[PDB]
Symmetry: C3
Subunit: 386 residues, 3 copies
Amino acid sequence: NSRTVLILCGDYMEDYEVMVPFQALQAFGITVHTVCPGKKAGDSCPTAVHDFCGHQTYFESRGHNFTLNATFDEVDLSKYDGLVIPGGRAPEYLALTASVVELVKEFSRSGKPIASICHGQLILAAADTVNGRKCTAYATVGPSLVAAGAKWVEPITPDVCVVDGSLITAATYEGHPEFIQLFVKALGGKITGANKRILFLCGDYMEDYEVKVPFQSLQALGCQVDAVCPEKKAGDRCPTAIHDFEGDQTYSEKPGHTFALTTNFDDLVSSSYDALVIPGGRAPEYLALNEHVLNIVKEFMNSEKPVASICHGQQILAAAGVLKGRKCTAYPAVKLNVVLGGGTWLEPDPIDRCFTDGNLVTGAAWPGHPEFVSQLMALLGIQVSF
Amino acid sequence: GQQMGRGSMANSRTVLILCGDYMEDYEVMVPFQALQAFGITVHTVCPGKKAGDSCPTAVHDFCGHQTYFESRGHNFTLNATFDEVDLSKYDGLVIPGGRAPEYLALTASVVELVKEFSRSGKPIASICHGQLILAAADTVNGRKCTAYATVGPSLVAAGAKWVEPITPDVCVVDGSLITAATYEGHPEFIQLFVKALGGKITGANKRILFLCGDYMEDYEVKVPFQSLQALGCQVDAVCPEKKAGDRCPTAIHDFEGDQTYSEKPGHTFALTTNFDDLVSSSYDALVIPGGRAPEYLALNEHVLNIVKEFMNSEKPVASICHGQQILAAAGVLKGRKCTAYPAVKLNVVLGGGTWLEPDPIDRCFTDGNLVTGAAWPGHPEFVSQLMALLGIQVSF
Amino acid sequence: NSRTVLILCGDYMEDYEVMVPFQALQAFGITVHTVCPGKKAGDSCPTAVHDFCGHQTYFESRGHNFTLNATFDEVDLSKYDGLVIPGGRAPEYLALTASVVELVKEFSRSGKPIASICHGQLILAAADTVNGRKCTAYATVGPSLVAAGAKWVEPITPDVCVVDGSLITAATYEGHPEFIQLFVKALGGKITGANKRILFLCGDYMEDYEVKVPFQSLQALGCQVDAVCPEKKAGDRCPTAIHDFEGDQTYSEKPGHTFALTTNFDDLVSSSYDALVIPGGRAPEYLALNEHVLNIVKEFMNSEKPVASICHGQQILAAAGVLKGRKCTAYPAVKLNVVLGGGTWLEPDPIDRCFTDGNLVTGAAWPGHPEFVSQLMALLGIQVSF
């Protein structure tokens, strides 16, 4: 009934490509270990934000530091049911690290599932494990996979995934939902109950992980997931903020990935949605002022549909007056808004704790994604069974 | 550093600023330096930190999006230690905004401090997000107050008579409680606090012009400009080829361990009058911020002409840091005495001037009509010496 | 017959204005030493990237850290034939360091050549060594030079250079080609065979040094050098990336100087050039997918004309199929591409070593520009003789 999965990490792997699988898979009940050659449990890796700005290739800036939870030197490969390889700029050097090539060789000859995304596939080409195997990758990776005897599948769109028995591949983090889903299925997983429409209340400078990880995690299960922002329409984008904890008395801020909205705020019917999700960051403080944002929250809470809100997301719940006589957590500073909103505080120590009060699920910040999503799934009647 | 018990004199005051990591860089530095220029001793504390430690600050600006964006501002060095504060010694409390208030508001020792200060009745001036701490200290029930618009629901839930800020410069006073929405309200915010402190301003019916440019230093424009507006001066800012409501990007210059200063983007700065409509003889004084604008401004003939016009008629001219490149190039420093950013001693000496060593770095000097400072730490003496030339006084 | 040259460095000196002469002059056979007061050999200076973006003056971001190879305190000036002084924001504080003014004064009295660029000339004003001498500089440096008695030449375009006897000046890094050439001449050097046409295959996020250093070194020799990028015209620009080694397991990335293309990609005829150069960075991975790019590379390789590729540029050669049975080095990660493209790997140890195999020169990364450009010159019949 359970699984354990290894993620092969390195310096400047793409932030989304490690974090989404890492937390979506934990949310689904699987144990996940992260390793990097040369590093031990509790070391960190810098990450890359790869995005487009209309140049002929992607731009890069720094993402959240990513703290490993395991020690590469001590990994016993027989304890793992599958392997995940994030993209970004880590694979190109990990592909030349003898200890990584050996690990990947060994894991591939066991026949266990390997899910590899974007530049990840370079490590597979170096390990010579793709001969006669069908696979996609970031388009610039295709020549090397071709030269390694792969059956290359040109990614006609950025969300393309390929499955070839135990080999799962994707081109970019845009393919995360099908990529993760195909990997869960490869592990023997069966997903039930995912026929749900979910709405995300987004805004500018919401937190980069706190929108993308729950959004993709729920898509991977099979949910129809929509993202709205007042005054914007489908295909408009929201800048995002990366909040990290770099030793000051509060978090740091830098730009994250831009995030594509999918539907029109004015067009929305709340009745057609099964649940609401509220990312944190700096959008909730201003969304908390929009009446139509408050009306939507009031409708869900009234009708006892699941509402999941994380971190600063609870500022909109408090301002809507829907926290009265309710129990919830939030970012520690947002305890002010919870208590002032008539709510009872649940203490987020450690900061990845999440809580359920009837139809309301709350978390405190991005480390809490596994619990946040898991507890949302329980309210939605979604199960992953092995 | 300041003489730390000076505000105890009868004609003076001591004010405490409640600081924290990622407080808004203007909302700490402008009252920190304006209040000193007005003859007030100011202490700065952060919970869990001591005198001499420093706090990161946030630069909060708008850029076309639905809420502000942020980058790092100047590091701010504390001059007092939080857990040795004797509250009974302070006549006033200032609370900056930015990202510090939300966590300070959940710090028990900070809430204890604002409660205790609140029941004393002495003036509290809180700006932008600072007001979150007041909500948490429960000190606003039935009191009139404004704040950044997003601090609204909290103030209301704490029983405030909330005043939605219609424009970003809105300020509210309810007895000794003074509140502003954003730094755009600094001039009135600071004026109202000075007044609540018993301060009386005389002589401030003056017109003052700032010679601005791209990548001028962020504090060296903002601080003198808003300090002078807080006195009730009409202050205008011009840049060649730009007009009213155009903006200049600014540079944050700080010292971070290398043999010279580092540079990062600062806040954008709005010019107030057209470069070409301006009538320079209608101004009482000239101010020249530093940074990297002066080196290119020093090549503009209209800029040099305005400089010669003021020095000619012996009107007050205040220049700081690199500003003195413009003066040197204008030929107007010949036989004159001044300081500058240390590097700019080259320009001063080459311009026939006599060098006044900026030691310590916050020292400013006056030679007749000419006030000069070396860098942004010198703003208290810099605005003080310009006030004394203009006949402006703040009296307690 | 050789020459030893000193470069007077400081913190926040302009990245191009130290690196370009540092590496061109070594390529030309000259020994170059780099010093900064208060620092010893093996210490580093931060650098500034000064670029234009439509504001009324330049903007600044951080460039590559620069490692000094000599110790200021230990300089014996009678052993240097020439002196170079980079611009940026270092000269303004350098000009008030008494040991720096003394050094320049002593050097100037000897009548030996001094090349000073941009803001560099502030130190000359401070040293009072410009009275009656014809010089240019960055426009904002004019009044100081005039006040020091200079015969000022207002730079009308950013590439203006002036030579007055042993004094060579330039206004900006746009003037590097003539600036460097004039300095080589002042040292008694004679350049022969540089009447060649060279084509740089450029792209977005190519590496900042890897385009600029080889490009401007080739121009300083007298070569006509064109730069092209798919879908772009003469006058278009590419953003560049700065890759530096800052203690992580792979390089960091930050924006570099934007680079102007000189000629239209679509009109281009490959046969009208004598040689090809390919910079590294992140452009090669995407350029390797462009058919016309690969056609240009096959034409040069087939006709056996000199081809010089550095770092990641070899991704393009490899995809072109032209590394089959060839010998070459590349950025270490790029070995995957070399081997999979049928090449024989040459270990770039030390990292600044370059290799020639017939018409093909390869280097591993920017530290290798001295040998990269030296070996290209050898194939083109270009020489610098003293």
